[PDB]
């Protein structure tokens with residue numbers, strides 16, 4: 001893809017103007033804020049008012065212990081970790097605003113944005129650069145009954161919930177047809193008595209030899225051409241799925257105490273859907289190995305631009321790259337501004353061992 | 357570059373054989389270790405015996421204050437931070453070996469490698485995949501007297517050492533000829549009474565506007581075509597530099613209480629010189645966005661493949677990516693083994 005360069009002909013907001021605005025409060029956005037705040041760039045971070053359904057702090061506030069974020073040899077809850085992130089962001093002078101960003105206009109620079117409830121045309125605020133760190137959510141199908149048994153038998157992270165006592169030596173279902181499903185199904189055979197994999201199609205997304213290992217497994221039944229149409233239970237836990245074969249028409253109840261969605265994630269791209277290039281799955285496209293979107297001056301970090309790795313530690317590293325690339329652009333344009341005195345020009349100071 | 361795919365008929369080692377060996381012990385290698393151990397792949401991580409002049413744990417073992425690694429809002433010392441990384445790697449079952457890997461043979465898989473002092477031909481060990489996380493050294497220029505005043509006036513990290521009292525309101529010098537020199541000199545104007553920039557070339561490799569701003573800063577003097585030839589002091593701390601002009605040959609004395617190198621990020625790639633695709637500066641080339649090197653089965657993480665960001669948090673992230681991609685390759689090759 002190409003990078004559009006917006007004309008720098010837009011008006012400056014008298015309500016609030018910032019050199020860099022961060023949208024989103026997961027590990028991606030807070031790491032960007034830490035770096036920009038320490039660079040004295042006075043970042044503004046919008047953490048959301050239950051934005052996209054998540055409290056400030058992001059997806060990690062919906063899990064418990066985190067054990068693969070380095071620096072915590074005894075583990076740390078997702079809640080504590082994101083309190084730590086937010087405190088570090090704040091400590092160095094991030095302006096953290098508990099508001100959802102409702103709309104952005106990327107047409108001209110400085111970019112215009114509006115917070116939820118302050119959305120009249122004359123209430124815009126401006127940003128010379130924007131870092132999009134809005135995250136993602138796991139895809140669900142919202143089956144009849146799912147509202148009842150979500151997190152009471154129905155899950156969207158098999159490696160997170162697999163060992164939970166409610167699944168142990170119980171029949172389990174996985175919905176999915178990709179490498180995600182065949183991987184999560186194999187893992188669930190450590191705990192369930194049996195794992196059914198419901199595949200909408202008759203064939204495979206995962207490498208044709210790998211799902212051959214699925215079928216060969218005695219604790220695994222792949223139900224091809226099969227979909228789930230309802231989630232039933234007893235008032236406390238999921239106890240069965242209504243399933244249907246779409247080629248043979250066979251339908252009936254499949255008792256399971258567990259249903260694990262492995263159908264992907266939905267990136268939180270609503271703010272920019274028609275304004276930055278997106279990939280086939282809706283993720284923000286970035287110059288590979290970089291935070292740069294298809295719009296000059298707009299950067300993206302975290303899961304909103306990563307469908308492959310999807311970790312806190314990669315989201316954090318990715319937010320640092322966004323901070324460093326936004327600051328470099330800001331430094332470049334301040335250097336080219338002959339009106340600003342040299343002593344007033346921002347220069348990054350982010351390296352330790354230089355590379356000249 | 358193309359990704360060469362090695363034959364998988366190589367001799368398996370009887371001394372030790374592993375599914376994945378991680379070379380290096382900074383934030384990159386330990387994050388990869390954590391993920392691979394948790395994936396029950398039993399990673400082997402060589403943390404070095406003072407490899408590259410750094411204790412196990414990497415570059416951070418020479419800073420007392422890490423403030424921008426998220427999760428530590430009150431800061432942490434670099435050695436405490438990397439001790440925590442090491443404890444996490446070992447908690448989930450990493451086999452951590454305090455040895456420098458001295459030699460690697462990437463020609464066939466499983467790859468052969470040798471640790472320092474055990475480099476006889478028959479002493480090889482094998483790894484089905486390797487994660488190169490060897491980081492970077494601190495490259496000190498040739499400078500008589502540098503031995504006496506290194507870390508007593510001379511320093512390779514402006515943003516680390518700039519604020520210590522010995523430099524405060526005193527003349528300071530920066531050696532370098534690009535953006536890093538411009539960045540460090542401007543930062544040091546906050547603390548020095550004045551900052552000279554010693555530029556080896558006739559033109560700052562930095563953009564013309566960056567070079568333009570450097571020269572017109574009221575607390576900065578860019579000395580073009582200038583090299584340091586001697587560091588001088590009272591026998592305890594640095595007090596001046598002898599400098600030479602490369603175009604006129606004139607020699608002078610420059611009073612400075614601090615000298616900061618803005619060069620000397622050397623990626624640690626000697627192990628794989630001529631075996632993986634390297635850029636002009638010795639950095640390992642990776643399929644962008646990935647950890648994949650020019651040889652199938654070899655992944656890279658951290659500063660050894662990142663000339664651009666060079667942070668511990670980005671090194672950790674890229675170590676995770678290396679691990680996920682090595683786990684994936686190991687997975688497809690186990691599944692295909694019928």
Ligand SMILES: Cc1cc2nc3c(=O)[nH]c(=O)nc-3n(C[C@H](O)[C@H](O)[C@H](O)COP(=O)(O)OP(=O)(O)OC[C@H]3O[C@@H](n4cnc5c(N)ncnc54)[C@H](O)[C@@H]3O)c2cc1C
Pocket residue numbers: 023024025026027028029046047048049050051052053054055056057058059060062063065066067068069099100101102133134135136138157160268271301302303304310311312313315316
């Ligand atoms: C159940 C579960 C368990 C997990 N466990 C682990 C684990 O153990 N280890 C690990 O490494 N990873 C884990 N992850 C993944 C990890 O949480 C994500 O990779 C990471 O949090 C993504 O960070 P992010 O920066 O993309 O933002 P997110 O964490 O996705 O957070 C985005 C935030 O931005 C806010 N936001 C969105 N839109 C707006 C807007 N318009 N205005 C303002 N705010 C907005 C949202 O409200 C949200 O709070 C887990 C994920 C889940 C779902």
Ligand SMILES: Cc1cc2nc3c(=O)[nH]c(=O)nc-3n(C[C@H](O)[C@H](O)[C@H](O)COP(=O)(O)OP(=O)(O)OC[C@H]3O[C@@H](n4cnc5c(N)ncnc54)[C@H](O)[C@@H]3O)c2cc1C
Pocket residue numbers: 352353379380381382383384385402403404405406407408409410411412413414415416418419421422423424425455456457458489490491492494513516624627657658659660666667668669671672
């Ligand atoms: C003085 C200083 C201060 C810094 N402060 C900060 C800071 O505050 N924040 C920040 O984000 N970054 C900071 N950095 C940068 C940060 O330390 C690096 O970006 C990061 O550590 C790179 O990690 P790495 O995984 O590439 O490995 P490195 O940190 O480079 O460590 C690699 C390790 O591998 C070992 N090794 C090398 N070769 C071999 C071999 N053949 N066999 C076995 N072991 C081997 C080495 O001994 C070393 O211990 C600082 C750097 C320096 C020099």
Ligand SMILES: [Ca+2]
Pocket residue numbers: 099115116117118
């Ligand atoms: Ca509001």
Ligand SMILES: [Ca+2]
Pocket residue numbers: 455471472473474
């Ligand atoms: Ca030895």
Ligand SMILES: [Ca+2]
Pocket residue numbers: 606607
């Ligand atoms: Ca003379």
